[PDB]
Each structure stands twice: as structure tokens, then as C-alpha cells.
Write a protein that binds this ligand. Structure first.
Ligand SMILES: [Mg+2]
Ligand SMILES: [Mg+2]
Lengths: 414, 414
């Protein structure tokens, strides 16, 4: 109703599990607030250059702007941060990509990024992190990191089931706990806020199934389930046991003998994928001390949040980290950084993240060559030391490029 | 009743907030399971050498072995992993130190380490991490890390309030949530485990008060509250707001203008301590990318768990990381690593952690000179490259010492 749907262009179709992508598909994009106004132009430009170059004019993307966050209130009225048609359109057109989103404080509004994931049931947050040769890193050997995070998006403490301290609701559930459930374990029951952490068996099994499958399809070496199950036995511990059980029941998992680790034979490459687990705080140490030991990672929402942030910082990619939120009916690719309002409009921040989310999207559409051209361009520009301010501060010998220029530098290196 | 309390020796006294330490105090020690049998002898030895050297025979520690974990079942019978007198004795004699602890699976037993903290109400987990010059580090600039973690020990999801999926209890609280609380937010209510996360106002304020005080007393530069309050508003967000409020109300905090950060003037040194906060996943990035920006850290239980593990790995100290659990009535110093059963009895693992927990204990007793001699010894042995296998693997030019020998190497460098 304020979205102008492209005159030329045709809907991506979901013909039973498989995407049927036309040569001129309509892709919804949400510009994003803050520096969204800088990085989303650079991304439209390098993606159009990359499918122009790859298919020699045969294909073109019809971009369709849709709204969420701050831009949505400037388009539909002060009070609408998430248009109900944004959710219908993402679902209708099947893939979309978004820039950073501002969520307001003072208005009782829950995080808009999370809200999209939950509302659309995009239960897989897929964050690939690998080192791009030449980016400044705080660690001695960032080349050793080549991991893929499968973070569960729909349950855990992120579900948003909580009550304020001294509220009547909190007073009530705490009464239910102490009186009806007999819980003698809340140190201070007065002035106490309460959060709920749910972990179901369908919720962890649809995620782990996606991770092992990814591992077969890209014939990766292992799947590590990470969890804090020794303390939280019935949510995080349950997660790990449902994960092993699924590897045993659906993927023909066998004990690497003695247990607990399992071996899954990739039906395609013949290799063996080790299914293993490690306690989450020890994992935070293991990624820094022995990164080559880990490959595909499956975990719950809060852990997945932390893991991907820590790993993106160690490969020097806190501004070039790609992200996808995939459900069964649609997928939403996104910049993983914030809106950085101080820099908005200066054309200076790194477009890197949203551009690599655009390559994940292209790869997801099956337009593999266009997607290969982008990681080619990226490697080329980073190696040329033709870089944006955030990388140049840390490099000696680098040429400082604006956001839009770094876009053109990716197209030059294609 | 199986504890032989020293013939010579005298109880530490708590004469209203202040410890009255005699010259021959009785200190309870729990040996620990696994490599506890290797590292606890080395610690008794370097601490006795350090108070012998410091006070020229005037003082001596009367060590009193008390039991928990696996050793306790070999002493009191198969079923007692935590003697009720362990808790009375730690509380009576005021300071104690423990080695690693095995908690069994298959028996419905909750983590013995956590259980001690909760049972004794030791609400401050105090983990100092700083770099020891010469230890192998995975990062380029570990010298930049000099942080102190104040982790809340008594509430959060660690409190252990959870129910199994398909259990009657879980069926009941989920019914209460959906029907009586109107929660439409559990994606899969069937086959779902449920965990409870409590965060009270007395619980976060007794912790933050301890952290700011530490900061005045050691005139550190800042206190960072870390939290995930944008998602968990009423527990982690509450934590941050109760923390700012306490800095404002008790420590005369003032806006570093515009907000949100506050300035506390140290009544002793005259300097200003900045009180600030940062979202926890971004913090995991900030410690690696800008460690010099952070000093004293205050956070809840799960975050504190993760932060200290990640920081100890970046300074190369996953085996020499000290720890204290401090309450108002007693304190328990501890090895922070696990029991490492494959290595137990080989005299090979690093005694480093429990020895630096012993220096924190000495420092806590006011026996400062003995405590200074230990960090002197430690620096000396690490710099001599006279080291245990875990450091030698990563060093070129190092002399490989057994656990007990590394003990003697600390006494030589004193
Ligand atoms: Mg995050
Ligand atoms: Mg831990």
C-alpha cells in the first residue's frame, strides 16, 4: 500500500522444498536505518554488477523496497515500526535482504530483528565466518578459522517471556513457583524480575537437522553441538541429547568408540563427519586456542549470539560478517552490525557485511556464479589494500576508500 | 568426624566485617579430585615457603583437610559427595581453598562447585585476569589485558530451577504460563524443557557494590556492567539499571554528560571511575579488539561464566587462572580448571591456577608480603622459561618441569 511492486519482474516460487527462481525475480530489500542508507546502495550496485557480469544480461534482479524500523514510521506514520505487509511480502516473495534496524526505547517495543525471525519463523540463523586474507586481525592465526554457525532462532530466553520486578505478574508467577511448585531456590523472591527459557524437542531437532545436512551438502568435517547442559540440564542438556539422538536416528550415527562422539558417513563424499559436543564456556576458549578443530557449529539462541560475535571479532570481520535467517517458507539475509547513527550519510562505513549477506542470498537462489564473483571481488579489494576507514586504521600501506568506492573496488576485482 | 583439626593453630575470626587473622591460622583445604592430587601438594608447599620467607618464621598455616566430591565418598561412604560439615567448617574457619571437583552423572546431582557457592551464599565470584609476561598467547597483544571480573553467583539461570520435557511439573508450569499468564510465545509447548532465570534487586546491588568498592580500594579506572538487557529487559536490563542507580545513590555517581555513563570520584585517590555498560555479545568482541578500554567488570552468572573463560584463554592463562567465591561470612579460593582425570597422578599438569588462588587468599588474609612473593616467584619461573608441559609445547627454548618441580621453580624465583 506504499510499496511499489516492479512493473517488470516475477515472483520466486517454492515448488515443494525447492526454489524456482525466475531470470528476473523480485527481491524485497529493507534499506535499514542509520548507515543502512550508505551500505544498501553499495550492495544493490555490486549485486547488479555481479549478475550482469555472470549471466551476460540474461538475468536481472527487480528490487522492491519494503519498510521496517525508523523508515517505516516516516512512510506509514509515527507508530508503525513493523508494517504487517512487510511480513506478508517477505513470505510471498520468499527471499529478502535487510540493512541495520533501529528499535525504539521508551515504547515497550521488542527488538525488531528478533521480531522478524520469530514472526516469520526463520528458525536457522546461519552465520559463516572465515578469514579474508589480508584483513587486520587481533589474533596471530585468523586463517585457522573456517566455521559455520547454526544458531536456533525461535526459542531459548530470546522468546521474550519475562516479567518486571514488583509487577503483579511477577508477584504471581513467583507465588506459583514457591507455593505450587515448591521452589526454594530463588535467593531474593522480593524485587525480582523473572525470565523464562523454553527448549523444545522439535525446536532443537529442526535446527540440528539443518546443520548436519549443511555438513553433508558442503562436506564439512564435523558438527559441534555447544551447550551449558551440566548446569541447565533440561534445556541446554536436553539440546545436546536430542542432537545426538537425531544424528543416531536420522543420519545413521555410530559411536566413535566408547562414546560420546558419533560418526555420520556423508552419503555423497564417503567421508566421516564427527558429531561432538563441548561445554559453552570452554568452547569460547577452544575457538581461540584450537580453531582448526571446529567446523559446523549447532547451538541455541543466546549461545549462538555470543559465539558468532566472538568468532567475527577474531577474524577481524566485525563489519564484514554475513548473516541469514532461514525458515521453511522464506529467508532473510542481513547486515549483522548496528545502525551506527554517528556515521550515517557520511558514506564511510564498511558495506562488507551486507554485501556478503547478498552473496549468501545469491548462493541460496542457485545463482552461484554471481555469488562467486562477489567473494572474488572482496578478496581482490581487501588484498589490494583498497579499503574503508575501519580497515585502514589498522593497516600500513592502505588506500582509504569511501563506502560507495569500496563497492566499486569490489566490481573492479571481479 | 573424619576431619582431624590441627593440634597447634587457631581460628580466623570475623570481628564485624574485618578478619582477625592469627599468626598460626587453621586453613581448610579440599584437595580436589583428578589432578587435585598433583596441584594441591604443590600449592601447600609454595604457600608454606612464601609465608616462611615473608615473616621469617613468625607465621605458619595449619592446614586442615576437609572433603567434597569423589574423595568424600571414599572417606564417608559411597553416597556422600558433599558432607554437611564441609559447609559448617568453611563457614567456621572463614577462608578455605579447593582443588578441582568431580560431580557424578547418573545420580541427579547438581554441580558441586556451584552448590558450595549457593549453599554458603558466596555471591561474588572474583576472577582477576592479567597477562604474565612470557606465557604463550594466541593473541598479538595479551599485555593489554588487565581486568577483574565480579560475577554474580547466587541467581540467574544457574539457580537450577528447571523441569524436564514431558514431565508432569513441566506440563504444569507450561499450562500455568499459557492459561493463567496468557503466554502465546512458546513455539513448541509440547516436549519442552523449562528453565527459570531470576534477577533480583538485592542480588545485583550487593554484587555491584562489591565491584565499585574494589575499584575504589585498588583505584582502578572503571566499572563496566555487562548485560544482554535489550533482549532480556527485566532480568539483564534490570541488572544494568539497578547498577547505575546504586552508583548514583551510594557512590555519588554523576552523568558524564548526556548520559548514560557515570563518574564516581574515588574518595581516596581523587580520580574518576567511569561507570558504563556494554551489550554482552559486543563485549565479547570489545575484549579482543580494545582490551585496554576495560578494567573492573560486573555481570550476572552466565555472562560472568563466559567472559572469564574467554579472557583467560586470550592471555594464555586457561591453566593459571585464579578464582575466589566471596560471601559476607566466608570465602573459598579455588582452582578454576577441571579434574583432568587422564593426567591425574602423573605430576604433570600446571599447579598455576590453584597457586594464584592461594595468593588471592593470602592477600585476603592481609598477608600481603607472602602473596607478593608468590606473584614474584611465578613471574620469575615463567620468564625463566622453566615451565610445565602445557606451556612448553607452545614455547621455543623452554625447560620442561613436572608439576612439583614448577612448584620449586616458584620458590627459587621468590
Ligand atoms: Mg548478536
Ligand atoms: Mg566456567
Amino acid at each position: 500500500s506504499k510499496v511499489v511492486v516492479p512493473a517488470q519482474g516475477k515472483k520466486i516460487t517454492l515448488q515443494n522444498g525447492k526454489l524456482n527462481v525466475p531470470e528476473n525475480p523480485i527481491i524485497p530489500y529493507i534499506e535499514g536505518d542509520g548507515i543502512g542508507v550508505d551500505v544498501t546502495p553499495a550492495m544493490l550496485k555490486v549485486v547488479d554488477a555481479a549478475v550482469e557480469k555472470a549471466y551476460k544480461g540474461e538475468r536481472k534482479i527487480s528490487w522492491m523496497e519494503i519498510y521496517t524500523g525508523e523508515k517505516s514510521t516516516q512512510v506509514y506514520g509515527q507508530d508503525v515500526w513493523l508494517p504487517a505487509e512487510t511480513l506478508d511480502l517477505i513470505r510471498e516473495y520468499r527471499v529478502a535482504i535487510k540493512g541495520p534496524l533501529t528499535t525504539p526505547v521508551g515504547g515497550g517495543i521488542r527488538e525488531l530483528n528478533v521480531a522478524l525471525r520469530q514472526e516469520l519463523d526463520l528458525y536457522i540463523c546461519l552465520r559463516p565466518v572465515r578469514y579474508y586474507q589480508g584483513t587486520p586481525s587481533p589474533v596471530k592465526h585468523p586463517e585457522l578459522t573456517d566455521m559455520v554457525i547454526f544458531r536456533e532462532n525461535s526459542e531459548d530466553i530470546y522468546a521474550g517471556i519475562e516479567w518486571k520486578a514488583d509487577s503483579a505478574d511477577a508477584e504471581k508467577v513467583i507465588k506459583f513457583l514457591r507455593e505450587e511448585m515448591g521452589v526454594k531456590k530463588i535467593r531474593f523472591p522480593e524485587h525480582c524480575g523473572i525470565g523464562i527459557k523454553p527448549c523444545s524437542e522439535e525446536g532443537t531437532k529442526r535446527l540440528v537437522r539443518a546443520a548436519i545436512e549443511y555438513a553433508i551438502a558442503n562436506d564439512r568435517d564435523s558438527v559441534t553441538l555447544v551447550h551449558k547442559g551440566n548446569i541447565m540440564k533440561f534445556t541446554e542438556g536436553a539440546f545436546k541429547d536430542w542432537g545426538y539422538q537425531l544424528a543416531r536416528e536420522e543420519f545413521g550415527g555410530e559411536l566413535i568408540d566408547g562414546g560420546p562422539w558419533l560418526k555420520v558417513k556423508n552419503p555423497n563424499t564417503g567421508k566421516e563427519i564427527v558429531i561432538k559436543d563441548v561445554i559453552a564456556d570452554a568452547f569460547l576458549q577452544q575457538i581461540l586456542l584450537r580453531p582448526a578443530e571446529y567446523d559446523v557449529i549447532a547451538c541455541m539462541n543466546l549461545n549462538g549470539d555470543y559465539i558468532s560475535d566472538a568468532l567475527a571479532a577474531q577474524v577481524g570481520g566485525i563489519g564484514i560478517a554475513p548473516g541469514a535467517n532461514i525458515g521453511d517458507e522464506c529467508a532473510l539475509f542481513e547486515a549483522t552490525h548496528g545502525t551506527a547513527p554517528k556515521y550515517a550519510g557520511q558514506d564511510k562505513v564498511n558495506p562488507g557485511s551486507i554485501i556478503l549477506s547478498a552473496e549468501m542470498m545469491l548462493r541460496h537462489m542457485g545463482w552461484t556464479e554471481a555469488a562467486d564473483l562477489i567473494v572474488k571481488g572482496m578478496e581482490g579489494a581487501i588484498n589490494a589494500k583498497t579499503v574503508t576507514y575501519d580497515f585502514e586504521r589498522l593497516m600500513d600501506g592502505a588506500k582509504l576508500l569511501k563506502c560507495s568506492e569500496f563497492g566499486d573496488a569490489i566490481i573492479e576485482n571481479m
